[PDB]
Amino acid sequence: RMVSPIESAEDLAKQTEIAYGTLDSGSTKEFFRRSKIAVYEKMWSYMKS
Amino acid sequence: RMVSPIESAEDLAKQTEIAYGTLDSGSTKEFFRRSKIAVYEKMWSYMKS
Amino acid sequence: IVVTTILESPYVMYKKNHEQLEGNERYEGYCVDLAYEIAKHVGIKYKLSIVGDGKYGARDPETKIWNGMVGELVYGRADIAVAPLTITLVREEVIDFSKPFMSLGISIMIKKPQKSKPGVFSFLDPLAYEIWMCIVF
Amino acid sequence: LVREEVIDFSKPFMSLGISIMIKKPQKSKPGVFSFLDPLAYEIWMCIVF
Amino acid sequence: NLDSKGYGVATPKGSALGTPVNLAVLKLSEQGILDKLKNKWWYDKGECG
Amino acid sequence: NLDSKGYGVATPKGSALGTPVNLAVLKLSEQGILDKLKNKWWYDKGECG
Numbered sequence: 001r002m003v004s005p006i007e008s009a010e011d012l013a014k015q016t017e018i019a020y021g022t023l024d025s026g027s028t029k030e031f032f033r034r035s036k037i038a039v040y041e042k043m044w045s046y047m048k049s
Numbered sequence: 050r051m052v053s054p055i056e057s058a059e060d061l062a063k064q065t066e067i068a069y070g071t072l073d074s075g076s077t078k079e080f081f082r083r084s085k086i087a088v089y090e091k092m093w094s095y096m097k098s
Numbered sequence: 099i100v101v102t103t104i105l106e107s108p109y110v111m112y113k114k115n116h117e118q119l120e121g122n123e124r125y126e127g128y129c130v131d132l133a134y135e136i137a138k139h140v141g142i143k144y145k146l147s148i149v150g151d152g153k154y155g156a157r158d159p160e161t162k163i164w165n166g167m168v169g170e171l172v173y174g175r176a177d178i179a180v181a182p183l184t185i186t187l188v189r190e191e192v193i194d195f196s197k198p199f200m201s202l203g204i205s206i207m208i209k210k211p212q213k214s215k216p217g218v219f220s221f222l223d224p225l226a227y228e229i230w231m232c233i234v235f
Numbered sequence: 236l237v238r239e240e241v242i243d244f245s246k247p248f249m250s251l252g253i254s255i256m257i258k259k260p261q262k263s264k265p266g267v268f269s270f271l272d273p274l275a276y277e278i279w280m281c282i283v284f
Numbered sequence: 285n286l287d288s289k290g291y292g293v294a295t296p297k298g299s300a301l302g303t304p305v306n307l308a309v310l311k312l313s314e315q316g317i318l319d320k321l322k323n324k325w326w327y328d329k330g331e332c333g
Numbered sequence: 334n335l336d337s338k339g340y341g342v343a344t345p346k347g348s349a350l351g352t353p354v355n356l357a358v359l360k361l362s363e364q365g366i367l368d369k370l371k372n373k374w375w376y377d378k379g380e381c382g
Contacts, residue, residue, distance in 0.1 A: 014333060015333060016331070016332065016333035041324075041328065042328045045324070045328045045329050049329060051211045051212075051213070052211065053208060053211050054208075054211075055206065055208055058206065058286055061206065067208075069206070076184070077204055080204065080286075080287060083364075083365070084365060085365060085369070086365065086368070086369070086372070089286070099301075108325040108326065108329070127325060128321050128322070128324075128325040131321050131324075131325075132293075132312075132318075132321065135308070135312055135317060136293065136305060136308045136309070136312075139304075139307075139308035139311060139312070140301065140304045140305060140308055142301075167294065168294065171294050171295065171296045172296065174296065176296075177295075177296070177299070177301065178293060178294070178295050178301055178305060179293065179294040179295070180293055181291075181294075182291045183291060183292060183293075183294050184289050184290070184291060184292075185246060185289070185290050185291070185292045185359070186359070186363065187356060187359040187360050187363055189294070190246075190355070190356065190359055191356070192297065193294045193295060193296060193297060194294070194295045194296070194297055194298075194299065194302040195246070195292035195293070195294055195295075196292050196293040196294075196295075196302075196305050196306040196309045197239075197244070197246070197247070197290075197292070197306060197309055197310060197313075197339070198246075198247065198250075198290025198291055198292060198339065199290075199291055199292070199293065199309050199312070199313065199318055200290065200291040200318070200322070200337075201247075201250045201288065201289070201290050201337050201339070202285070202289050202290070202291070203285025203286060203287045203288050203289055204285060204286040204287050205285050205286070236307060236310040236311055236314055238343070239306070239307065239310055240307070241346065242343045242344060242345060242346060243343065243344045243345070243346055243347075243348065243351045244341035244342070244343055244344075245341045245342040245343075245344070245351075245354050245355040245358045246290070246339075246341065246355060246358055246359055246362070247288075247290065247339025247340060247341050248339075248340055248341065248342060248358050248361070248362065248367055249288070249339065249340045249367065249371065250288050250290075250337065250338070250339045250340075251334070251338050251339065251340065252334025252335060252336050252337050252338055253334055253335040253336050254334050254335070287365075287368065288362070288367075288368075290339075313337070316336075318337075319336065319337075
């Protein structure tokens, strides 16, 4: 009864057992590269590394 | 719920099951050697012997 | 301006393709960014250098010669050292230190606690030992 | 920074920061007859009736 | 922590970059840039989450 | 802590006591005298247990 699925980008960033990515050389990749939001910056660092 | 057996230097000093150490030659070892505080004095006594 | 440094993660690191890279673009890490920001604020052109012997700095008790980054600064081989160089009395007597950009200390590392194999008589764990004794009484 | 421009500060003789102070949580002392807590008083009374 | 230490930006004695570097460090500290770098390089790139 | 700050011993700009005071504070820090004084005035005289 306590299980909660992923429901936002913060949930993706916090966890580590689910990988995530995006199309290479696209608009989403540029969005994540240029983002100044903490969660999106963390996501960019993860995907790049 | 997982509880760590150690939560401070005092806990390290009191117990004896868990060993502890430092580098063979470094700033930490010199700090413990020169320490005049009772807790760190006891920790140094344990580590040297 | 020569910025002496020591290769120590995460302070300084080699990029995944540092072989094809030249100059400051080779390196990355906390102190690379710190040197970049300090140069920006002071407005200077700087080149990162890795001290040859890879030592923070100490005085030879026999030759009385400083080594490492402190040696580079003392003898004029470097202009600034952006590295995890602790502020100490001996070093402070031969160089100038800025205020601590990072504060640290001695701390305890322990393996993360992990679920232990159940004991043989772990079925008595829900109730305290005093409860069992008083139940018998 | 503002002060450092007009006076000379030595190295920090004591480090600090911004921290949160909260009223210490009162220790929980179970009542003598707290084993009746799961059910309301009216439930016990109506059970007797 | 069992003691207090700090990392500094060393400079040769009498150099003109001493005061500018000290003030740059203080500025970066007050602007939160040092904390941002610490978080980026310790936790954003951390592999544990 | 939400940030990192430090207390320092101030002096007039260009004063002759600047470097002696700085070295004295560093020596006290390395000798454990500052930690001893803090422990004395915070916990040894601590009304709480």
